[PDB]
Design a protein around this nucleic acid. Structure first.
Ligand code: TRP
Ligand code: MG
Ligand code: MG
Ligand code: MG
Ligand code: MG
Ligand code: MG
Ligand code: MG
Ligand code: MG
Ligand code: MG
Ligand code: MG
Ligand code: MG
Ligand code: MG
Ligand code: MG
Ligand code: MG
Ligand code: MG
Ligand code: MG
Ligand code: MG
Ligand code: MG
Ligand code: MG
Ligand code: MG
Ligand code: MG
Ligand code: MG
Ligand code: MG
Ligand code: MG
Ligand code: MG
Ligand code: MG
Ligand code: MG
Ligand code: MG
Ligand code: MG
Ligand code: MG
Ligand code: MG
Ligand code: MG
Ligand code: MG
Ligand code: MG
Ligand code: MG
Ligand code: MG
Ligand code: MG
Ligand code: MG
Ligand code: MG
Ligand code: MG
Ligand code: MG
Ligand code: MG
Ligand code: MG
Ligand code: MG
Ligand code: MG
Lengths: 114, 209, 123, 118, 16, 56
RNA sequence: ACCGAACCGACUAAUGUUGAAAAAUUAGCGGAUGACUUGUGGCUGGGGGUGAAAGGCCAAUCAAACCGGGAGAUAGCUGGU
RNA sequence: UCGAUGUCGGCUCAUCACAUCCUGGGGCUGAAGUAGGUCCCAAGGGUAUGGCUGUUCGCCAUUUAAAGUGGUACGCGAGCUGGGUUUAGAACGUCGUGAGACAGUUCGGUCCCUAUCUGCCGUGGGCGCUGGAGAACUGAGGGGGGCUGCUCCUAGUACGAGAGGACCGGAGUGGACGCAUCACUGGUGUUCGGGUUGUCAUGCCAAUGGCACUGCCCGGUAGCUAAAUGCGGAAGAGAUAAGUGCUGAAAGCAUCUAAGCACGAAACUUGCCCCGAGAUGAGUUCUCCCUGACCCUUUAAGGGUCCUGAAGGAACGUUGAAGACGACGACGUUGAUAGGCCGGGUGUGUAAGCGCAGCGAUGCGUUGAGCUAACCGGUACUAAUGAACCGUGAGGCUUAACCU
């Protein structure tokens, strides 16, 4: 309702970049080990985007040392420090869930040149 | 300590700066008007009665209107009672806000949990189903056996059977108070509270502690 | 969410390839073992010249699950396998000398500091 | 439990429901008053009224959208030629339900559903 | 005539 | 399963105690035609709230 | 000989069991040019027929059909009087 | 009991006893500590998964604080199964001359019932509660819940030659169980969007629709939900069991008991949550409503006529995170109750038409376009009609106290 939208709107971020599924993206997140706080980078293809305002999330997939890793980031969370898209991908779908079953040359994504 | 009557508005998250997201329930707790104060002399116990919100003037019946006019306050949507401890006293016609709950850490939230209708034994009592195959015939989600043979030759009281589930008064205890917001009339507690969205709740300071 | 009779890959170089979770230790009627949890395993495939043979029963720590871990801001880290690191029955320190693949910060305790030190990537 | 769900099942499967609401929308547009059972009249409101809005905004693509929902060129023509400009100043509520008793055969609540300017 | 559960043998010979 | 003893006319009446119909509380007069009708229903002639809604 | 419809059959499961049906329905299943299957007609008769044999089948009945007769068999048994 | 009381095992649901398996309290020890042995109190909760086998049992593997012993028609087939033992087929070994027979074995083999009554789980109607009614309560009583591991500090302290290693108290974090919820991660989402095979149709191209399990698939809103995430078990108090005592005689001593006094457990009564005045012992508080006339008689808690119809309710309609039906909640023009409409949000993924490139399938621009169910904020366009109906007219007798 109006109250919930007001609370969410005073919590949301103001500078999330516009990215679409298929994009290769670097997400720098905060990692706290011991007492030191630093930035760890996760680079991969956004395979899913769920837009719900404050509750918006996006699923990124990478291949890490021979293992496929999916991370679902909360877009407005303080731990997600920075999002930067490196490569625009050309897909015809909103959720790229076949990239799990595909591997290697088959998981290639064409570049979106406009 | 007495409580306040609010309404469940919905749930949200609160991101806090060490980056943890607290699931909060937002309870709109606007000003509750003390209507009647009861005492040991006249009624035999100590309580206050509060009302909240507003109700249609053509639908406030004459006894309710007379009661509210005797207190001298505008008609609300209901009447609730709160037992008083010994050190605390209130007067008739008096407004109470969330600034009372400004200094509490945990609350007890009471509301009418949602009605699931006539529910079965598997949904109601966590009964186990029987086999879906291996010959089983028309007995997949049935209750099973409900007794012993000739002794006692009866079904014992309180036997867990199917029936009405939900739509009933439920208390969730010891919920953290994430935020008290006086100017917007908001109480943000951590976690879920019983009932549907837009529904009446009674929030009291925690009794367990 | 690893239960009994579950086939897991070995994320170290002890000499096994597949193992089967046969018991979830640490509780009565316990059903599942998440990331960072001790299980009892038996070995179903082995490298011919490994440190362990087929048919050994020993312990393991679940370090990767397809169900994934949840992070306190609400995040979730999922993998494409179930992978464990073998441990002795008594010492409960790893047998192998190297760990393959990423592991998670949910193993960051003093019990598994060797695994965290030898892992290639800690997510 | 059907908390916050809409629509009536009407003792028919989904294809039968869609087919008869297409038929009833065609009949109601053709005749401008029809007598049907009361829940069928309420669901006929929910089917018919967006078709009159689509008729308010005239285009070739809107005509093609109405031919896909009514599958009838005569109904599409009468919509876009008459009920567009007739209701062009009215914001919703193009129909009216008047209860008229119970069927002799099976004791039903009948109701006339009619367009408002008839 | 007769009921099938009376003609049957597994339930009629229930207590031999 | 089936009864062991025959129920009586007393218990038959007690079960049928709740079977009684309820007549309509009151009919209506129309402000134009003057005909009694069910409330929120059009009349037999085709009037409703004083307007001829259906022809004939 | 092989795969597979018609056609013949009846291996498994659920439904039904005061059934839609005094033996079926649904989904799968076996044979399907042969020791095959089928229409019309004929023949074999009850201690008898016929039987690639189950005491199986002989008109919803079979360790001896059905119908009438000896017959109101007999009943140291049960019920009723 | 033979004019029938269905049998082992499994499943589902259990409930009771205590001769206690764990957790709780203590005495003795051939009890240094850790771990035990044995006995006494204690029934609040808890009290394995698999391999083999028809198995209960047992053995084995691996856990747990523990994997209790029994009753209940060796609980439970008008609740499921049908592996075993129990019909008809067939075979083996053995017995018999044979038909056949074996608590010997092996393969195959129809498990019915629409619930009248009691019981139990839910949910209503009537009347009562002494004028009628709307609310909020009090709490007699009744039920739910009651489990526990591990790590860390105290402390490598007490104890011990070493090895080892605490009681008491405190902090954190788990397993099983239970309630609530849908903000998150998910599942469903045959009512939304798209891809596509075959075929048919809309005169034909283009575009669409029907049918094939939703034709097959890919996503997915709201709702419902768990695997998701909040909370819980308590602390405290009273009276105690085993047990430990203080003072103290009977019995000049001694003695926990006879007089008197104090401790003492998850059992008991409360404390926590829910139902709860049909609690016929029907309770309390606050508010609202009704202040006419007349006639008969077996002259009393009597009947009848006219006038009057209140507070409230019911009915009717729009309906709901409420619901089998009743019921409960919101609203009825002085209106946001539902549908529609407007704007947004979400989901899908760049519509059709046209133009351009290509021989063409097709690609690009208009274009994150079109469409978008149950969602969010709004808006009287449609539907919730004036009425009519039920409910009355000051409410018994006796005895005390107050005013007068
Ligand atoms: N009960 C089944 C089989 C059956 C028919 N007649 C029987 C006689 C006896 C035993 C079983 C049956 C049926 O009705 O079709
Ligand atoms: Mg409901
Ligand atoms: Mg089960
Ligand atoms: Mg059956
Ligand atoms: Mg709705
Ligand atoms: Mg029907
Ligand atoms: Mg279809
Ligand atoms: Mg009898
Ligand atoms: Mg052949
Ligand atoms: Mg045959
Ligand atoms: Mg057969
Ligand atoms: Mg068949
Ligand atoms: Mg063959
Ligand atoms: Mg063949
Ligand atoms: Mg024989
Ligand atoms: Mg025959
Ligand atoms: Mg003979
Ligand atoms: Mg003779
Ligand atoms: Mg005779
Ligand atoms: Mg009998
Ligand atoms: Mg004892
Ligand atoms: Mg207790
Ligand atoms: Mg066993
Ligand atoms: Mg038994
Ligand atoms: Mg038993
Ligand atoms: Mg049995
Ligand atoms: Mg029984
Ligand atoms: Mg058998
Ligand atoms: Mg035999
Ligand atoms: Mg031989
Ligand atoms: Mg025998
Ligand atoms: Mg049965
Ligand atoms: Mg109880
Ligand atoms: Mg939601
Ligand atoms: Mg999803
Ligand atoms: Mg789907
Ligand atoms: Mg679709
Ligand atoms: Mg074409
Ligand atoms: Mg067709
Ligand atoms: Mg206590
Ligand atoms: Mg003395
Ligand atoms: Mg007890
Ligand atoms: Mg509206
Ligand atoms: Mg969008
Ligand atoms: Mg299209």
């Amino acid at each position: 309702s109006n109250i919930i939208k007001q609370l969410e709107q005073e919590q949301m971020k103001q500078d999330v970049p516009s990215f679409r599924p298929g994009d290769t993206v670097e997400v720098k997140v905060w990692v706290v080990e011991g007492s030191k706080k630093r930035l760890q980078a996760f680079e991969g293809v956004v395979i899913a985007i769920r837009n719900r305002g404050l509750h918006s999330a996006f699923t990124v997939r990478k291949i890490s040392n021979g293992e496929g890793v999916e991370r679902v980031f909360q877009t407005h969370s303080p731990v997600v420090d920075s999002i930067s898209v490196k490569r625009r991908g050309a897909v015809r779908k909103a959720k790229l869930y076949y990239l799990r079953e595909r591997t290697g040359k088959a998981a290639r994504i064409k570049e979106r040149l406009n | 300590m007495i409580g306040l009557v609010g309404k469940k508005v919905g749930m949200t998250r609160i991101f806090t700066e060490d980056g943890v997201s607290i699931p909060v329930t937002v309870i709109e707790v606007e000003a509750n008007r003390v209507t009647q104060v009861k005492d040991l002399a006249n009624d035999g116990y100590r309580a206050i009665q509060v009302t909240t919100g507003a109700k249609k003037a053509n639908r406030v019946t004459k006894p309710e209107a007379g009661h509210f006019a005797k207190a001298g306050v505008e008609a609300g949507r209901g009447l609730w009672e709160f037992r008083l401890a010994e050190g605390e006293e209130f007067t008739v016609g008096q407004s109470i806000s969330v600034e009372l709950f400004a200094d509490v850490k945990k609350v007890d939230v009471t509301g009418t949990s949602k009605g699931k209708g006539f529910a079965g034994t598997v949904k109601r009592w966590n009964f186990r189903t029987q086999d879906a195959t291996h010959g089983n015939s028309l007995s997949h989600r049935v209750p099973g056996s409900i007794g012993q043979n000739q002794t006692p030759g009866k079904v014992f009281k309180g036997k867990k059977m199917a029936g009405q589930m939900g739509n009933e008064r439920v208390t969730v205890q010891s919920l953290d108070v994430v935020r008290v917001d006086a100017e917007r009339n908001l109480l943000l507690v951590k976690g879920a509270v019983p009932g549907a969205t837009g529904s009446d709740l009674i929030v009291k300071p925690a009794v367990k502690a | 969410m690893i239960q009994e009779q579950t086939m897991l890959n070995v994320a170290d170089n002890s000499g096994a390839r597949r193992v089967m979770c046969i018991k979830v230790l640490g509780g009565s009627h316990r059903r599942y073992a998440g990331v960072g949890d001790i299980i009892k395993i038996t070995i179903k495939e082995a490298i011919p010249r490994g440190k362990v043979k087929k048919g050994d029963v020993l312990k393991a720590v679940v370090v990767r699950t397809k169900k994934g871990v949840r992070r306190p801001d609400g995040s979730v880290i999922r993998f494409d396998g179930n992978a464990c690191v073998l441990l002795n029955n008594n010492s409960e320190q790893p047998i192998g000398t190297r760990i393959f693949g990423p592991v998670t910060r949910e193993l960051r305790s003093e019990k598994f500091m060797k695994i965290i030190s030898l892992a290639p990537e800690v997510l | 439990m059907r908390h916050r769900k809409s629509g009536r099942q009407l003792n028919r499967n989904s294809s039968h429901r869609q087919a008869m609401f297409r038929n009833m929308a065609g009949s109601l547009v053709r005749h401008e008053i029809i007598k049907t059972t009361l829940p069928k009249a309420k669901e006929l409101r929910r089917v018919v009224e967006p078709l009159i809005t689509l008729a308010k905004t005239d285009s070739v693509a809107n005509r093609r959208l109405a031919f896909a929902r009514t599958r009838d060129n005569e109904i599409v023509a009468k919509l876009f030629n008459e009920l567009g400009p007739r209701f062009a100043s009215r914001a919703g509520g193009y129909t009216r339900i008047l209860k008229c008793g119970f069927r002799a055969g099976d004791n039903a609540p009948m109701a006339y559903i009619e367009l408002v300017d008839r | 005539t007769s009921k099938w559960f009376n003609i049957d043998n597994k339930i009629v010979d229930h207590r031999p | 399963a089936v009864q062991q003893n025959k129920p009586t006319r007393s218990k038959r009446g007690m079960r049928r105690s709740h079977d009684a119909l309820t007549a309509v509380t009151s009919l209506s007069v129309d402000k134009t035609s003057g005909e009694k009708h069910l409330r929120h229903h059009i009349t037999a002639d085709g009037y409703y709230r004083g307007r001829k809604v259906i022809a004939k």
